[PDB]
Ligand binder design. Structure first.
Ligand SMILES: COc1ccc(Br)cc1S(=O)(=O)Nc1cc(-c2ccccc2)ccc1O
Length: 309
């Protein structure tokens, strides 16, 4: 007799605190194979940690100014980083060495992602452009005049045919990867600080700097769900879909907590306490009920939390 579990709430509990960065942490990401956690920081460094035990593995260095974002390739062998030095760098994680420096942006690079094939990288910058890069050659393939204010997030869908971008200009835009042309603009116009596609490819999850997260059917232009109760008026704070156990939405917050909501009811189901500064970034492990969170410069640590569901 087979049943479907429906947990009312998770029970994430602190397991490890990861110290080592000397300035604000800016992003954390789990490797797709689930073995590693990468972190980036205003201290110009990337650090690699064991995903299950938080054990320090290595520091990856080379950027000349702070880093805002890091992202993994699909095979977990490469990382790309986005820096205030106006470059992105592609790293071989095993060797810890820089393979390519992606030059073209004219101001801080704020956000980056590989496509699932991992032959392309997308970036967004304070220069208000989105760029599409060839991983092999390290050269820019396309520059999209995407926005009229800094670009806060860029994300590919699962076949890599679409990019979604967000900006402080208050817009979310859907771009056709192959041509670079805009497919859709979603629009008051509060600054959009984060966006990504949902697991089923149908929605975008968008954060705005009015303490609001919204799940949009982008083809219809209809808001399906809204998540509130956290604090987000200043920083570009990632949000996540938790796909391993219960259906949750996860976000950091400017009141130093991690917020977790019920996807469908929109109720807060847990708040995780421990950090002593803004939780700027959270990540959800790809197969286990594990959350990584990271905080700004009064804290500078990463925390690993684990749930039974
Ligand atoms: C596999 O998809 C996942 C997995 C984990 C997460 Br958390 C989210 C998704 S989803 O949003 O992409 N699909 C998805 C939507 C809903 C839903 C229902 C009503 C209104 C709006 C959304 C329910 C279940 C769902 O599975």
């Amino acid at each position: 007799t087979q049943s479907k579990p429906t947990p009312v709430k998770p029970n994430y509990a602190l397991k490890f605190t990861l110290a080592g960065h000397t300035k604000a942490v800016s992003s954390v990401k789990f490797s797709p194979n689930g073995e590693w956690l990468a972190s980036s920081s205003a201290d110009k460094l990337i650090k690699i940690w064991g995903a299950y035990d938080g054990k320090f593995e290595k520091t990856i260095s080379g950027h000349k100014l702070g880093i805002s974002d890091v992202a993994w390739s699909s095979d977990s062998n490469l990382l790309v980083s986005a820096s205030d030095d106006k470059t992105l760098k592609i790293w071989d994680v095993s060797s810890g060495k820089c393979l390519k420096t992606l030059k073209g942006h004219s101001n801080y690079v704020f956000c980056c992602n590989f496509n699932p094939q991992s032959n392309l990288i997308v970036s967004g910058s304070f220069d208000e452009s989105v760029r599409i890069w060839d991983v092999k050659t390290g050269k820019c393939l396309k520059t999209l005049p995407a926005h009229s204010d800094p670009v806060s997030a860029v994300h590919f869908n699962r076949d890599g045919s679409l990019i979604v971008s967000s900006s402080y200009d208050g817009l979310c835009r859907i771009w056709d990867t192959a041509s670079g042309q805009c497919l859709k603009t979603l629009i008051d116009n509060p600054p959009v600080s984060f966006v990504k596609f949902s697991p089923n490819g149908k929605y975008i999850l968008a954060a705005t700097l009015d303490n609001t997260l919204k799940l949009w059917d982008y083809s219809k232009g209809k808001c399906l769900k809204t998540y509130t109760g956290h604090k987000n008026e200043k920083y570009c704070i990632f949000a996540n879909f938790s796909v391993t156990g219960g259906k949750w939405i996860v976000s950091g917050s400017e009141d130093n907590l991690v917020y977790i909501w019920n996807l469908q009811t929109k109720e807060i189901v847990q708040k995780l306490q421990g950090h002593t500064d803004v939780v700027i970034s959270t990540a959800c492990h790809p197969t286990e009920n594990i959350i990584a969170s990271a905080a700004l410069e009064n804290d500078k640590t990463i925390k690993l939390w684990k749930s039974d569901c």
